[PDB]
Write a protein that holds these residues in place. Structure first.
Motif, PDB file in Angstrom:
ATOM      1  N   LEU B  11      39.304  50.608  42.744  1.00  0.00           N
ATOM      2  CA  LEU B  11      39.256  50.590  41.284  1.00  0.00           C
ATOM      3  C   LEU B  11      40.610  50.786  40.610  1.00  0.00           C
ATOM      4  O   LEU B  11      40.689  50.659  39.387  1.00  0.00           O
ATOM      5  N   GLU B  12      41.665  51.102  41.357  1.00  0.00           N
ATOM      6  CA  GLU B  12      42.977  51.307  40.743  1.00  0.00           C
ATOM      7  C   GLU B  12      43.750  50.093  40.200  1.00  0.00           C
ATOM      8  O   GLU B  12      44.545  50.312  39.278  1.00  0.00           O
ATOM      9  N   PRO B  13      43.628  48.840  40.679  1.00  0.00           N
ATOM     10  CA  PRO B  13      44.434  47.780  40.045  1.00  0.00           C
ATOM     11  C   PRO B  13      43.954  47.364  38.664  1.00  0.00           C
ATOM     12  O   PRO B  13      44.616  46.543  38.023  1.00  0.00           O
ATOM     13  N   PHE B  14      42.836  47.904  38.186  1.00  0.00           N
ATOM     14  CA  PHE B  14      42.264  47.553  36.896  1.00  0.00           C
ATOM     15  C   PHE B  14      42.379  48.706  35.905  1.00  0.00           C
ATOM     16  O   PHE B  14      41.594  48.803  34.961  1.00  0.00           O
ATOM     17  N   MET B  15      43.342  49.599  36.137  1.00  0.00           N
ATOM     18  CA  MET B  15      43.672  50.628  35.168  1.00  0.00           C
ATOM     19  C   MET B  15      44.296  49.993  33.928  1.00  0.00           C
ATOM     20  O   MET B  15      44.900  48.922  34.006  1.00  0.00           O
ATOM     21  N   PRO B  16      44.182  50.640  32.779  1.00  0.00           N
ATOM     22  CA  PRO B  16      45.034  50.275  31.641  1.00  0.00           C
ATOM     23  C   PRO B  16      46.466  50.760  31.825  1.00  0.00           C
ATOM     24  O   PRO B  16      46.824  51.270  32.891  1.00  0.00           O
ATOM     25  N   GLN B  17      47.301  50.605  30.803  1.00  0.00           N
ATOM     26  CA  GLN B  17      48.712  50.942  30.945  1.00  0.00           C
ATOM     27  C   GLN B  17      48.902  52.454  30.978  1.00  0.00           C
ATOM     28  O   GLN B  17      48.372  53.176  30.129  1.00  0.00           O
ATOM     29  N   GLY B  18      49.654  52.927  31.969  1.00  0.00           N
ATOM     30  CA  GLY B  18      49.960  54.340  32.092  1.00  0.00           C
ATOM     31  C   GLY B  18      48.786  55.215  32.464  1.00  0.00           C
ATOM     32  O   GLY B  18      48.756  56.390  32.093  1.00  0.00           O
ATOM     33  N   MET B  19      47.818  54.679  33.197  1.00  0.00           N
ATOM     34  CA  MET B  19      46.596  55.405  33.537  1.00  0.00           C
ATOM     35  C   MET B  19      46.704  55.849  34.995  1.00  0.00           C
ATOM     36  O   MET B  19      46.372  55.100  35.914  1.00  0.00           O
TER      37      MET B  19
END
Lengths: 51, 50, 50
Positions: B11-19
């Protein structure tokens, strides 16, 4: 008591809709008299009359 | 813990910016360090007897 | 022969060896979207992949 009316979808997910008074009209016992309850003929009756 | 870290890796490559996702509380590395410590003391006990 | 049925994509196929597993055969995958990008983006991605 922050009632629960129905749901609504947003951005691909169904979440819920709540309904509560302001953050400025429930904060002390002087502000439990700002709320008015309708009479049986369209008039408005405060909570100072019966509470 | 391994499956939770794998799910956050999926699930990490779909974080928003700076998340950033950090792990403030975790009671698994004490279990890993304890089993590594007892297998290490087993190893040096066999080595000292030899 | 079913190409003489010109109005409908009449697609005939054989079942697999055992029928408990699947109705088709081969491979299968789902193109999904964790970001919540909508449905038109997902269908454009599906037809792009096709």
């Amino acid at each position: 008591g922050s009632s629960y009316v129905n749901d609504f979808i947003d951005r691909g997910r169904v979440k819920r809709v709540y309904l509560q008074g302001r953050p400025d009209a429930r904060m002390n016992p002087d502000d439990l008299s700002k709320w008015y309850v309708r009479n049986d003929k369209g008039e408005m009756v405060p909570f100072n009359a019966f509470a | 813990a391994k499956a939770i870290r794998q799910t956050i890796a999926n699930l990490e490559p779909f974080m928003p910016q700076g998340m950033k996702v950090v792990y403030p509380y975790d009671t698994t590395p004490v279990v890993s360090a304890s089993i590594h410590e007892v297998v290490k003391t087993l190893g040096e006990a066999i080595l000292l007897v030899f | 022969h079913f190409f003489s049925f010109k109005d409908a994509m009449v697609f005939a196929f054989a079942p697999p060896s055992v029928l408990e597993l699947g109705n088709a055969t081969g491979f299968d995958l789902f193109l999904q979207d964790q970001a919540g990008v909508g449905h038109e983006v997902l269908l454009q991605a599906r037809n792009k992949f096709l």
